[PDB]
């Protein structure tokens, strides 16, 4: 047991489906300067001939900032998907979906660049990144 | 420059006359005698060509420099009369083709020079005393490396008789 | 190797004569060297055009320039004309030269506030910001002095020779003497009854962490040191 007290990652047994390919615009839910981002990459993914990388809830993506204060605009950031419109299954068999697609901006390690998340987030995301539910007021 | 297998052989007529060859080049070799020239040494170690051959002046000069540096670092200028016996008289030519006209009017312009040697002919000689035959053989080897074909060395005494086997046995 | 020979021309007296030179030996030829213009050129003439084929009239040259030899008029074409270096080569050479300059300055220049060095990266940044006129045919060593002042105000710094006083408990002195004198300028090498080496060195001042870290790695962190005045 090396480093568990100060930690950024955990395990989740659900593995939702991949609903957002490269090119998708995400509304930002954290209280950072950014408002809208665009997906240009999915961390950890390897594909095939003429396949677009896609992401779902709990995955870390590489994105560009399109709207927000000039300090953040035109930069390449990392972020985590915290809710999606495409329904995904759980262990009991009941499906779950949300009202919109949204993300939260983090550091390559997994540390949030912000102190407040607005709206409900997914337990899958909160489980895989233990430093988010702390700063989220609703986790379903 | 171009590979030496182009000029190795001797199947072409001799081309050694400068009152008729237009634009012929000068030699890049000026020194043929090195060391001590008036010292009457005992043993004469001479290289010999194994077949007929055509040696470039570039190879000649490289041989000269290497062998002389070796003999200086090991034997000492006071010894080792070193001589190259052959002079470059042949003129080598290349066809100026590579817009071009290909094989139209092909007769080469002169590029370089070479020395012609026949079978069992002497190329170079080291005159040395007994206590440096090791280094004379080393020089033989070094020169052998830098030649287009193969060559063999022999040894001679005063009166110029072969004592190579007797001297090789007893070291 | 005419495949990638480039062109240089001199326009004067109402005509146009190109040449086919090696792009990296023309560099030396106009930089200032003992020049084998034979090796420089690709074809041994002077011509209207490299892609057409028309070598001009000998007495036309005689008239305009004054020479009969073609190598001499090509020499003067390279003198007073312009070479057709590709944008690739121009960019690459420009960058390499200004990198050379940035190193040549950083290695011995620092700010008189605290003695920190100025990294080559932000040296390059200050250059690109102020706007520097790097010549691609001039000698770097000789064009730096201008670039000094053109960038001093935007980024002030001085040529600040650091002078240091160093201690070693010599057990690896036979392992550090040569290594540390590779730098140079070692003054008053002194000793002690405990075989311990004490001295005062006068190296340039920009490179300090190199010296410190190499000494620490070579002595297993068993070295004492003190910075005397930064004699400029």
């Amino acid at each position: 047991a090396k480093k568990g007290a100060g930690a950024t990652r955990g395990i989740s047994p659900v593995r939702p489906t991949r609903a957002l390919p490269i090119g998708a615009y995400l509304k930002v839910a954290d209280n950072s300067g950014a408002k809208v981002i665009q997906i240009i990459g999915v961390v950890g993914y390897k594909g095939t001939r003429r396949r677009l990388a896609a992401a779902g809830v709990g995955d870390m993506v590489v994105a560009t900032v399109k709207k927000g204060r000039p300090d953040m605009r035109h930069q390449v950031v990392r972020a985590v998907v915290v809710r999606q419109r495409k329904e995904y299954r759980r262990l009991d068999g009941m499906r779950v979906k949300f009202e919109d697609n949204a993300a939260a901006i983090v550091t390559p390690e997994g540390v949030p660049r912000g102190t407040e998340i607005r709206g409900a987030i997914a337990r899958e995301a909160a489980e895989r990144w233990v430093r988010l539910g702390s700063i989220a007021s609703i986790v379903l | 420059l171009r590979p030496a297998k182009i000029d190795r052989d001797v199947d072409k007529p001799a081309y050694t006359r400068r009152e008729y060859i237009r634009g012929a080049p000068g030699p890049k070799i000026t020194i043929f005698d090195m060391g001590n020239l008036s010292a009457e040494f005992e043993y004469e170690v001479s290289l010999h060509a194994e077949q007929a051959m055509q040696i470039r002046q570039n190879a000649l000069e490289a041989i000269r420099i290497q062998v002389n540096r070796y003999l200086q670092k090991n034997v000492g200028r006071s010894n080792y009369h070193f001589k190259i016996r052959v002079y470059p008289f042949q003129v080598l030519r290349e066809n100026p083709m590579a817009y071009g006209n290909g094989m139209r009017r092909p007769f080469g312009k002169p590029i370089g020079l070479a020395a012609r040697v026949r079978k069992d002919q002497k190329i170079l000689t080291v005159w040395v005393n007994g206590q440096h035959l090791k280094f004379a053989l080393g020089a033989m080897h070094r020169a052998k490396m830098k030649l287009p074909y193969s060559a063999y060395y022999r040894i001679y005494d005063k009166e110029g008789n072969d004592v190579t086997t007797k001297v090789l046995s007893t070291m | 190797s005419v495949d990638k020979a480039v062109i240089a021309r001199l326009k004067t007296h109402g005509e146009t004569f190109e040449i086919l030179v090696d792009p990296y030996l023309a560099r030396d030829f106009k930089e200032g060297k003992d020049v084998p213009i034979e090796e420089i050129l690709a074809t041994p003439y002077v011509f209207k055009d490299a892609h057409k084929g028309d070598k001009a009239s000998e007495h036309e040259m005689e008239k305009i320039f004054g020479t009969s030899d073609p190598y001499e008029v090509a020499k003067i074409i390279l003198r007073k004309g312009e070479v057709q270096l590709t944008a690739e080569q121009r960019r690459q050479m420009l960058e390499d030269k200004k990198r050379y300059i940035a190193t040549v300055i950083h290695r011995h220049a620092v700010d008189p506030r605290t003695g920190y060095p100025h990294p080559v990266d932000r040296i390059l940044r200050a250059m690109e910001e102020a706007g520097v006129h790097i010549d691609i045919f001039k000698d770097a060593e000789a064009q730096v002095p201008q670039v000094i002042k053109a960038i001093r105000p935007i980024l002030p710094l001085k040529l600040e020779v650091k002078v240091i006083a160093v201690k070693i408990p010599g057990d690896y002195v036979g392992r550090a003497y040569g290594e540390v004198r590779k730098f140079g300028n070692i003054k008053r090498e002194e000793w002690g009854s405990d075989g311990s080496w004490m001295f005062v060195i006068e190296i340039p001042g920009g490179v300090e962490e190199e010296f410190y870290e190499k000494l620490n790695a070579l002595t297993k962190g068993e070295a004492i040191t003190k910075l005397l005045e930064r004699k400029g």
Binding site: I11, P13, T48, R49, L91, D92, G93 | - | -
Partner: protein, 344 residues
Amino acid sequence: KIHRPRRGSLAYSPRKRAKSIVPRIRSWPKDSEVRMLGFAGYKAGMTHILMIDDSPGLTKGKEIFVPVTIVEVPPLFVYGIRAYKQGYLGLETATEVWFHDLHKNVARRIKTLPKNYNEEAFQAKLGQLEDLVNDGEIADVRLLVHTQPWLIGLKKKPEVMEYAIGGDDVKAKFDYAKEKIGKELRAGEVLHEGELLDVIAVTKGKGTQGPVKRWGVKVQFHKAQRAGKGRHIGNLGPWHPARVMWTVPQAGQMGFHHRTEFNKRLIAIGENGKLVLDGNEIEITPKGGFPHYGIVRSDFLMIEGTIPGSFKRIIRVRPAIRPPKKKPPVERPQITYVSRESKQ
């Protein structure tokens, strides 16, 4: 150059119609327990349960959704014993012994049954086979079995098959077979709840299909879609070799293939249509009946996951020729809910 894997597998070729609707078993597992190594039944339908997870891995100890297939298994009848010997290359049949009293319907598969063949003749033949086996020539003993499709009113023409016996002693195998012949055999005497199984059946038919669906070929650019080539492959190959290669994807028969699956878990064995969960006896048949299959009434297997075949197709089962190293326990798991709502 762009690299990518080829489209489809070459391990299941030629992709042709199966030789028979009754599937053949090619290899048998090595078992120390002296028992019949398989059973056969008819596929009925699918449902789902909620159970507490047993197997190693994450999710262990939690309540999970599990899909389930139901296979109706009426008892088989053992009508024969075969002996095998070793020939030059492989095994060859040495002789057969049959029972004398067989159902009237067996003649629908075997049109030519013996005329008199009384019990004393049957016993004399058994004795001959026994003495033959008692020497040392014989190498393997197998049972001859037929289904009884008339109990569940599905049809009247039985399916006739051969099944191997576990162990490594021909004499033990023969004692088992001699105590079995002439009788009905149930699935609870052969299978154990919690086992892993391999299932064998012929897949659903789909007729002739093109390469997009038969091999996973791509649909061409929309210009080709408007040219008349959208659902075609580009070319059949290069100039040299000046022939079409067998590896090039083409249209042909799709479906109705012999296929084998690995490591499907047996959850529970039911009797007379009922399952006992917590003292209760509940019916697996959903309200309204299984779609395209009626009511289950005799005996049934509950198998995890999916299995090849249409609904009323004959299925064969064998134990785990190739199991993993971290098997789950051989014991019925804890089931919290079984769905028996309408399925249409």
